[model samples]
Target chain A: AVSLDRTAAVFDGSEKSMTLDISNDNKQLPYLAQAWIENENQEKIITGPVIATPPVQRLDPGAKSMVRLSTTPDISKLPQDRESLFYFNLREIPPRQIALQTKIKLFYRPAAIKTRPNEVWQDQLILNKVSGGYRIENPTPYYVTVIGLGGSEKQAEEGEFETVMLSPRSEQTVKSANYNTPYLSYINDYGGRPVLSFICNGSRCSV
Target chain B: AVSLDRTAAVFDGSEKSMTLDISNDNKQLPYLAQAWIENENQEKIITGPVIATPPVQRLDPGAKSMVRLSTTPDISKLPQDRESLFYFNLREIPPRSEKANVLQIALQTKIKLFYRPAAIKTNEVWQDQLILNKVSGGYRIENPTPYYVTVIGLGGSEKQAEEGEFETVMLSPRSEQTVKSANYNTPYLSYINDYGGRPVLSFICNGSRCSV
Candidate 1:
């Protein structure tokens, strides 16, 4: 951090902007600048599926520094959130762009208490701000709730495999949950992004 | 139809309102007042299912009526109409007071469009409204699109139980030309007081439901 002590110093107290380039870098999993967001909307919180596209990785010395964004080469009519998987693949000429097709899945936290109009519940959103040197901050919180439609299909709303939550690493399938009702939303913050901590089997410790 | 200029009568310029009670009045297919609106904001002429609650049909022979209206009830959970069907039940009253707890399929009319978004396509709603009676001065046509995203469960949006359009006396399951889908939104409408002349079908014009 820098400071100003005089009346006028042109570039003394200014902050530098950063950029990423993979032209000379070659690796399947390349180093990625972490992502950060300062959400101020009370409706959407950062408590849902926050995915990082093309997980950044380190490179080796002799490996060729080139890659293709997508394997199929058909970028049109592709589904949303496909940029993450389409990393740079090595070819004759290196591609200059990142197919950052990472779709952030955020839903209303059904587990939270319901406070309709005039009231709001709060929480914290802890995430990295890659552009801001990867610092953590609490944006805001939001109010959230869920409904149980007695029947998603023919199954009862209270029936098994109807409701569920995803852990950080634990795989909780509908069949495994004994047909518990599937969950609808869960990204509940006070008024902005929430602490995107890894949820593992009802435990909020793992990442 | 007398105008309010005749201050002697407390009536509007038009005498255009009728209430039908379909509780036990199955004898006459009550085709009461109707409205033809071209909803501009919705995708298809979207509508919730028709909700037919067990009417207050007292079995009294001479004192029986066709249909009647409830002054007030929960309407937030009712269904609005789409191009295909009216809303049947209610999770909560919808924007329009149009939902019930039960919907019975009656007469079905099939629809076929060359493409979407063209007002003058194969069957423009303009011509279709000709067969309908104006509930208001003329009739209000709003957003002409559909914008509801239903689920894909048993009786959800994608169910193949052949439950889209009108169900007639001859339109039975295990018969020919019948598309299958589940009927879930019926009961909600029953709580409210609303039903259609014959269950409307959007595209079963010919024997579309028949297999062979």
Candidate 2:
């Protein structure tokens, strides 16, 4: 009954607020779109650094609305070195029946750290062979999500593996005995899954 | 530019085909809705068991259409004891840009498609079968049923178990997931059923184990 304009949202520190489009797809009946923000631990905060304006909105049939995510003065309390993660949720409430909800990732990018032009941060990840499988190290200030991995580039694109979301400057050890080619894919800001081929030297690897 | 009627689709073996509604939210221009089926590995299939009719459709402004997913004879090769998983992809193609140096992107929406055979019956109370175990920081939810369970909400009490409280999670058949949250002795959860209904289940935790 409802749809979001984008798959994910990014709130830059330079801006005071960001707006997301929500549309009511039902052509006959009106519905309510309730927006909320959840912390990294999936807990709802009463008054957080960020707030959604008009938390509850009524949209007519085939009507569209925008939910503004404005940053409060409390945003300064958050870390200014790396990006902070949050989840933006929207629940569609019809006149009757149960409500359906949609949740998407929301990242707050600090103004101090700038992204490299024409390059993605995930390409700078480093991989090392561990005891059981491999250990992935994210050296950048941005978060990276590894969606697929395999022994070969083609195999990685066709294979399915456990998804691992690596925080900024964090390391994770993934247990995969068949991943020998150091080929993996990560989801980009635009929801595109681009494969990254790593150059390995003995136990160390770099993309 | 386009919105799907439902978050997911289920194709039963008894039905020959199923149709999904698609609407063009754009009020001024027309867009093309291209539909396709992808395997569980996210690879596009050319000759898959289920195919979408009118693969490419043009929707006028403020118009809605239905896309039919029909099953072929090859569907018989799939397993009957378990559900087969696929992805339904819908890409909206807009008109050409009138200006230069304009970046145009056709956003794609992908949803889960579960194909349940006739042999596997629908368990109306399957949500009650979920097992929750107390862990270090939070709890672990285990789906022991043969059907896919999409959890939408969780709370410490039944009245507080509302949607949009936590990140939506979809658990495959016989799969388990661990959620990090404050320890709650008795937790309540809501899951989406086959008929697009959200049913709440209350779990009573005893020591480290929990059940409905």
Candidate 3:
């Protein structure tokens, strides 16, 4: 939300960076920063590299940093629709794409973990608010555990299930997981708006 | 509107002040900027002055000068409202018992002339937009005068004349003779915000309207 022009990583061109900040866990944690830009109609408009910044590894609770994403050099060629959406998901995305064992990322660690987190917070930006228009106001939550805990490919084909109820900066224990996903965390109904929510707990015992 | 906190004139016990910018037409125009707090119903409320910065005066369009609006020690009564229309309007109310002829002498020469300007450009902040809530993209054209004009308030009393589409910024031009005798402007409605070939001329020329 600051200025998009200032979206550079310490003058050096780095795709990922580790940020250190105060986490809601009452301690500092490492947040790995990642970013991307998609076009109108919620399509895969961008992939890899144009994001210039270090791969930050640590950030605190209620921590914040900027993640810049450029889709193309010629922005005019992109969708002219002001209603297009752009966002920076400050959650967990993998460092590299993989095939099996679904990517198990985490947005919330035990507030007691007082340690850095493996975070992949993607910075999303909405092109037009008044004219073209965008619908995002919250951060999207995601999770994946298919191998042993997940169901068949049918469930796997859908996405990892996790979501929150408030915008990233809304000063609430609320965040939505509605941004684009690589594989396991994908959601077909991501209307470029709220990243819906569900509550599920895993069985710790042999069961 | 940026931080809004930045717009606040900060003051220490020391004699502090800042620069004020004004327009030539606004020169000597007295204004008082006050903040108020009211319920959603907008009935019960509490209000007072935040800072009595220097009043506006006529100067070159780009004239820059430093002036101070003294904030009395008793200004702790300021209300707090973050959302919307939280500014004040500078009024030119006259003394109740003052004579009509001497009324002109009672004018507060220096005041706040700005009634919430449309859109001002600022580059000091990180983004070009300090007031990020802007949507119009630009300011609207102020149609000074159109092809046709209306002579309002002439023929009869304030009760007699039908009132509509009135804007304080726009006033009808009338003469003292007709205005003093009764209430009416030489011209009523002036063609503004029109793009058509034919202009609309609506007049409200009345007796007393021209005088005051």
Candidate 4:
């Protein structure tokens, strides 16, 4: 399996280009990379300007390639002080016994921003009541990653594999696990960047 | 639609209690309640002592019920410092509806139960910091922290990043990796908060039926 070093990217409107690292786990087939702009529906739009170097290339086992993705002046159409989303779809050129494609997300954080991610949760979130559970109302210009949903009186539903990202200025409803009262236990700008410590030798510790 | 006031609970393994308030939206039918504990697999396990007063009850439309969940000596059986996986399942039973004479509907709530000790601060500053550098093609993310790192970023203007999936890329402690992108601007990102009881944790500890 090919692993992406950084899953997302940030952009400050004026910059010309940035790069991402792609590491191949020693494969028989060569891999190709493609970049495109996804609409709000996450649908493919025009074959935008984001371009990758060596559009398609082969990687020796345990080989690494530095793919450079460059953009054009078209970025001016996007809103300032906000992030735009994109996708990187990398797949093998010739199908092998097991063929796979890896899609990674790209984040463009422009310069001249008003709010910082560390404090956005406290400023823009309002957890209100609904018929069954609760709805998160996000009024800020940036997206909010809700980590925990709950109440003081009863246990909220254990959320499955999915996380609900309240798009900037949108509201999303979550079913009630408890009728007590719903509140946001944890809200952060980026999806959870969990902190870990691996100190004990099999017992415990940190890196 | 029901709304809650709190999302997480911290059990310092000692003196602390939490009361769950259940409010009804003025329904025509009455509701019943049941509670229990489950392991990481979500399988129901023996609830030794984490007791909920009135483990079972009935609620009338527009009425509210305060459920008190407490701990006892059995808490000693749990692990310390790290978090253990246990889900609090609260199911609501509503038998009658306006359209039908009888309707069987089950609504359940899943919450996290943590085992914390006093000395361990839940808000301890992360021991490591992340280093971002501009490489020849893309940028590199270096995890200086002792713990593993997971990152998510918002793309530049015109495009966006994917959320919901946890640990898109995991970095072992003190490790560094790079990603390719054409938009050469710093991206906004979020990482997993281990202290917050969202992700499941498994570590080697001294306890019965415990495996690292």
lDDT of 1 by residue, B2-66 (tens): 00111011111112222332222333222221111112221223232121232222322122333
Of the true interface contacts, the fraction found in model 1 is 0.00
Docking class of 3: incorrect
**Candidate 3 structure quality by residue, lDDT tens digits, A1-207:** 111211111211121223322122223322333333322222223442223233333334345545433323443332322112332223332211110111111122112222235333322211112222112222322121111111332332332223222323222221222212211222222111212222222211111
Better of 3 and 4 by lDDT: 4
The interface root-mean-square deviations, each candidate in sequence, come to: 25.8, 11.7, 36.8, 19.0
All candidates: CA RMSD (Å): 26.1, 16.4, 27.0, 25.3
* Residue range with the least summed lDDT across 10 consecutive positions in model 2 chain A: A154-163
| Candidates ranked, most accurate by lDDT first | 2, 4, 3, 1
Model 3 residue A204 distance off true place after TM-score fit, in angstroms: 14
- Give the alpha carbon lDDT tens digit for every residue of B1-212 in model 2: 78988877898888888999999987876788889998887667769698888889889889999999988899999988778889888877765332333223455667788998988766558678899898888889998977788888777876666635435788878889998767776788877887777778888877898999
TM-score of candidate 3 to 2 decimals: 0.18
Per-model TM-score on C-alpha atoms: 0.15, 0.51, 0.18, 0.40
Off by over 4 Å in 4: A27-37, A45-49, A93-96, A114-123, A152-158, A178-207, B1-212
Candidate 2 chain B weakest ten by summed lDDT = B96-105
* Predicted candidate 4 versus true structure: per-residue lDDT over A1-207, tens digit per residue: 455565345544456677777776655544443334444454555545455566666666568876776676776667775666666555542222223344455555566554455543344566555567556576766665554454431222233222466666787886655333343433333433322111223211112
Please tell me which model should have the higher DockQ, number 2 or number 4: 2
Please report the candidate that would top DockQ against the real structure.
2
Scored by CA lDDT, what does every candidate get? 0.21, 0.80, 0.24, 0.51
Model 4 scores a C-alpha lDDT of: 0.51
Lowest summed lDDT across 10 adjacent residues in model 3 chain A is found at A96-105
**lDDT score of model 2?**
0.80
